[PDB]
Write an enzyme that holds these catalytic residues in place. Structure first.
Site, PDB file in Angstrom:
ATOM      1  N   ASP A 124       0.844  -1.202   0.000  1.00 18.37           N
ATOM      2  CA  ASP A 124       0.000   0.000   0.000  1.00 18.37           C
ATOM      3  C   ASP A 124       0.875   1.246   0.000  1.00 18.37           C
ATOM      4  OD1 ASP A 124      -1.869   2.034   0.339  1.00 18.37           O
ATOM      5  OD2 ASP A 124      -2.866   1.080   1.996  1.00 18.37           O
ATOM      6  N   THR A 125       1.167   1.767  -1.197  1.00 12.43           N
ATOM      7  CA  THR A 125       1.990   2.969  -1.308  1.00 12.43           C
ATOM      8  C   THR A 125       1.301   4.203  -0.751  1.00 12.43           C
ATOM      9  OG1 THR A 125       1.155   3.335  -3.558  1.00 12.43           O
ATOM     10  CG2 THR A 125       3.259   2.115  -3.292  1.00 12.43           C
ATOM     11  N   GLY A 126      -0.001   4.142  -0.549  1.00 14.01           N
ATOM     12  CA  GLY A 126      -0.725   5.242   0.045  1.00 14.01           C
ATOM     13  C   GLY A 126      -0.710   5.285   1.559  1.00 14.01           C
TER      14      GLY A 126
HETATM   15  C1  LIG Z   1      -9.645   4.890  -0.933  1.00 17.58           C
HETATM   16  C2  LIG Z   1      -9.999   3.389  -0.930  1.00 17.58           C
HETATM   17  C3  LIG Z   1     -10.828   2.859  -1.912  1.00 17.58           C
HETATM   18  O1  LIG Z   1     -11.327   3.698  -2.913  1.00 17.58           O
HETATM   19  C4  LIG Z   1     -11.142   1.495  -1.904  1.00 17.58           C
HETATM   20  C5  LIG Z   1     -10.640   0.667  -0.905  1.00 17.58           C
HETATM   21  C6  LIG Z   1      -9.814   1.197   0.081  1.00 17.58           C
HETATM   22  C7  LIG Z   1      -9.512   2.563   0.069  1.00 17.58           C
HETATM   23  C8  LIG Z   1      -8.577   3.138   1.179  1.00 17.58           C
HETATM   24  O2  LIG Z   1      -8.921   3.979   1.964  1.00 17.58           O
HETATM   25  N1  LIG Z   1      -7.221   2.550   1.228  1.00 17.58           N
HETATM   26  C9  LIG Z   1      -6.246   2.991   2.205  1.00 17.58           C
HETATM   27  C10 LIG Z   1      -5.636   1.745   2.841  1.00 17.58           C
HETATM   28  S1  LIG Z   1      -6.829   1.031   4.047  1.00 17.58           S
HETATM   29  C11 LIG Z   1      -7.967  -0.176   3.199  1.00 17.58           C
HETATM   30  C12 LIG Z   1      -9.235  -0.395   3.722  1.00 17.58           C
HETATM   31  C13 LIG Z   1     -10.098  -1.293   3.101  1.00 17.58           C
HETATM   32  C14 LIG Z   1      -9.672  -1.965   1.953  1.00 17.58           C
HETATM   33  C15 LIG Z   1      -8.399  -1.748   1.433  1.00 17.58           C
HETATM   34  C16 LIG Z   1      -7.539  -0.852   2.058  1.00 17.58           C
HETATM   35  C17 LIG Z   1      -5.194   3.762   1.409  1.00 17.58           C
HETATM   36  O3  LIG Z   1      -4.580   2.947   0.494  1.00 17.58           O
HETATM   37  C18 LIG Z   1      -4.167   4.437   2.386  1.00 17.58           C
HETATM   38  N2  LIG Z   1      -4.822   5.675   2.871  1.00 17.58           N
HETATM   39  C19 LIG Z   1      -4.762   6.733   1.785  1.00 17.58           C
HETATM   40  C20 LIG Z   1      -5.359   8.083   2.298  1.00 17.58           C
HETATM   41  C21 LIG Z   1      -6.905   7.864   2.455  1.00 17.58           C
HETATM   42  C22 LIG Z   1      -7.609   9.121   3.037  1.00 17.58           C
HETATM   43  C23 LIG Z   1      -6.990   9.538   4.363  1.00 17.58           C
HETATM   44  C24 LIG Z   1      -5.487   9.817   4.173  1.00 17.58           C
HETATM   45  C25 LIG Z   1      -4.746   8.548   3.592  1.00 17.58           C
HETATM   46  C26 LIG Z   1      -4.792   7.458   4.665  1.00 17.58           C
HETATM   47  C27 LIG Z   1      -4.176   6.132   4.145  1.00 17.58           C
HETATM   48  C28 LIG Z   1      -4.389   5.073   5.192  1.00 17.58           C
HETATM   49  O4  LIG Z   1      -5.425   4.502   5.237  1.00 17.58           O
HETATM   50  N3  LIG Z   1      -3.276   4.807   6.120  1.00 17.58           N
HETATM   51  C29 LIG Z   1      -3.345   3.806   7.166  1.00 17.58           C
HETATM   52  C30 LIG Z   1      -2.028   3.882   8.016  1.00 17.58           C
HETATM   53  C31 LIG Z   1      -4.592   4.061   8.116  1.00 17.58           C
HETATM   54  C32 LIG Z   1      -3.395   2.414   6.455  1.00 17.58           C
END
Ligand SMILES: Cc1c(O)cccc1C(=O)N[C@@H](CSc1ccccc1)[C@H](O)CN1C[C@H]2CCCC[C@H]2C[C@H]1C(=O)NC(C)(C)C
Length: 198
Positions: A124-126
């Site tokens: 997860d690069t995000g």
């Molecule tokens: C944006 C999105 C979609 O459109 C579809 C599925 C998931 C997501 C999503 O939010 N993915 C996140 C991982 S957490 C995750 C949760 C459920 C499934 C897969 C990943 C992002 O990749 C990372 N995500 C990107 C970004 C999202 C908005 C808030 C600021 C960052 C926070 C960061 C994050 O969550 N960091 C943690 C340390 C809490 C892991």
């Protein structure tokens, strides 16, 4: 452009005549932009992250120019605090994860070994941090709180933990908490030499 992950992988995007900075996010299935002016039809949608859910406007067949590469696809607009480019658009610009090469048509899942246990986790690069679902780890921890797209979750912070990610060893901080998916974040991706290439 090959992109290492010691800092957030931010790119300049041009969308709807406007310039924005966005996060290349292999952990996101979708592309979500902060509230912005977009023209045309849209449909209401709900998307979940770590911490819960947000309501977004869904726009289809939107042209976006990501770091000088054009893509057309679905863009979601809503209360996200970071603009994020998700896999639906990363694949369109030929984005790969390198450490094996990994395309992004499917979620980039890997097997990890941690605390003697085997788990599947998302590259997860995000994500700045590594967050794992509830699991038995040994040692002390420190109360911590992390924010995702849906809000915040309580996690237990474990430091200097050994993880074997796809047969490469790394030692670092792991957070444990109510995440629906195990996340390998940049703090560990850098140690296994992960790069973003497109
Ligand atoms: C944006 C999105 C979609 O459109 C579809 C599925 C998931 C997501 C999503 O939010 N993915 C996140 C991982 S957490 C995750 C949760 C459920 C499934 C897969 C990943 C992002 O990749 C990372 N995500 C990107 C970004 C999202 C908005 C808030 C600021 C960052 C926070 C960061 C994050 O969550 N960091 C943690 C340390 C809490 C892991």
């Amino acid at each position: 452009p090959q992109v290492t992950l010691w800092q957030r992988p931010l790119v300049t995007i041009k969308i709807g005549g406007q310039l924005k900075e966005a996060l290349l996010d292999t952990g996101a299935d979708n592309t979500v932009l902060e509230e912005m002016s977009l023209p045309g039809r849209w449909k209401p949608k709900m998307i979940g992250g770590i911490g819960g859910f947000i309501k977004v406007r869904q726009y289809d067949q939107i042209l976006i120019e990501i770091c000088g590469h054009k893509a057309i696809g679905t863009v979601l607009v809503g209360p996200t605090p970071v603009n994020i480019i998700g896999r639906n658009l990363l694949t369109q610009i030929g984005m790969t994860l390198n450490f094996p090469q990994v395309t992004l048509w499917q979620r980039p899942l890997v097997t990890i070994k941690i605390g003697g246990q085997l788990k599947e986790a998302l590259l997860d690069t995000g994500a700045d941090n590594t967050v794992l679902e509830e699991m038995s780890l040994p040692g002390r921890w420190k109360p911590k709180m992390i924010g995702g797209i849906g809000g915040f979750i309580k996690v237990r912070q474990y430091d200097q933990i050994l993880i074997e990610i796809c047969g490469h060893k790394a030692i670092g901080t792991v957070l444990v908490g109510p995440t629906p998916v195990n996340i390998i974040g940049r703090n560990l991706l850098t140690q296994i030499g992960a790069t973003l290439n497109f």
